[PDB]
Amino acid sequence: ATITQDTPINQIFTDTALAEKMKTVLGKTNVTDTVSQTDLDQVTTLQADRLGIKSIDGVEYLNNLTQINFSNNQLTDITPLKNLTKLVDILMNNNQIADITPLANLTNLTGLTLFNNQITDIDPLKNLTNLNRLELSSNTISDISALSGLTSLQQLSFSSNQVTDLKPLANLTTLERLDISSNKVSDISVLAKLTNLESLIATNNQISDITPLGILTNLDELSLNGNQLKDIGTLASLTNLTDLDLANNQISNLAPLSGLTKLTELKLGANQISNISPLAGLTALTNLELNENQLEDISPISNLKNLTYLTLYFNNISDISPVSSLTKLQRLFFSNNKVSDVSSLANLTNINWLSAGHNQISDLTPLANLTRITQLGLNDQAWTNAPVNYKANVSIPNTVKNVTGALIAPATISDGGSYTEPDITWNLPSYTNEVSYTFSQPVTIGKGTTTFSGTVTQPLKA
């Protein structure tokens, strides 16, 4: 393709925004300035991302292009690329591309990026057999049969599509990094063939059987977050794992994890775990997530000295003290537990985020010196005091203490009760099984601000 004679830039590149870009690339000072075919032939690369480009009409005259970036534009038609066979790499994610037929004869392509488009039919990719990187996330693809002959692929992603059948991956043994997240996958048997895999991301699918992973011993990163896992016996084989995400499944037995001592990050939130003894020897862990389980005894955590990030929220934990030795902790989340005594938290001197809402916390004084706090959560505590004798007039000490050591006055007191520091008093004409009070006090520790609030239940004993 060649322009017949010298033509104004804005007659070649009809797109207002591409014209301006080409003016700069071609060294001219105005869009109406004329350019020759020899000027056009000098352009070998083009960075034209995020410019609000709606058409690449004109690009077919840029014969020598080897690399293009048109990502984050408003492209639909990519017809002008059809004959640009010197193209080695294309970045074209975040457009509105529906038809990739113009890519079919671009056989020197080694990298092709097309995520966030409107692509359904990937048949035009079938002869692009030099591809080593292919990215197809967030399209409407349901058939990956066109991938079957792409035998040089090392990196492949098609997350956020409508794919059920992985059989076309069978012969792509060069694969090292695969992402199949958010598809319709239940059967991962074909993956047993991809023995060079180092990373497999497969979150948000319908996987229950992970036996095909057994011989994928080169895996260092595995994500099976949001599936239907229970039996994780196979993972014992994966001795190279450093990063493992198994959150949102049905796992109870953690014994297969006990030998995975290379692990630095481990996510087990939202499962059926009651026993964390198998995690005791995983001392290289910096991140550990254990939220939304059925934990009470967290003592096996005390050994994990390298932890900087830990979640424990939504469990049945009364005793938080096994965290005391985790002196590198920077973020700790334990909302929705049964913790009253936070004396051990005084040891976590590098704590920055402390989320402790929905516990049984009455006294903030052990936290007074934690001045590296930037995020704090102390809302909606609730506890029941040891019963006191029901009397015509009952008096109890207020036990709610701010970080300063001072008592926090009740916000409300049930049954028309009153407060005279330090005592809450009720006049009770007849027998009642319980009385209660609430408190709500904004508080800052360091630079972390929260409302320290709760409901205190006082059973009355006859």
Binding site: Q155, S157, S159, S182, T203
Partner: protein, 105 residues
């Protein structure tokens, strides 16, 4: 402030990363998700203002992802804001400030 019911791991991303893109950084969560489904979004420089869409979040899962290789000599830190909503329309959280640090290759 305000922390609310957000659960956010610290976020760093090495510069000059290899694909495939987009790549998962961290999964963001609101405790409001066990009392109904939550839907996530992000704002800020690198998200909805220039450079747009360097970072994206998967609406239903909270997975925060990076879409291209980074360069510490261009942008070394990004400040993002996450948002959480139900089925519904509310707003089960106030926005959370999210720092992302670009680190060594």
């Amino acid at each position: 402030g305000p922390l609310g019911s957000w659960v956010i791991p610290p976020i760093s991303c090495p510069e000059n990363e290899k694909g495939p893109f987009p790549k998962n950084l961290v999964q963001i969560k609101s405790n409001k998700d066990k009392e109904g489904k939550v839907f996530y979004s992000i704002t800020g420089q690198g998200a909805d203002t220039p450079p747009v869409g360097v970072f994206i979040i998967e609406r239903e899962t909270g997975w925060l992802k990076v879409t291209e290789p980074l360069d510490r000599e261009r942008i070394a830190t990004y400040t993002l804001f996450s948002h959480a909503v139900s089925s519904n329309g509310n707003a089960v959280e106030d926005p959370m400030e999210i720092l992302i640090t670009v680190t060594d290759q």
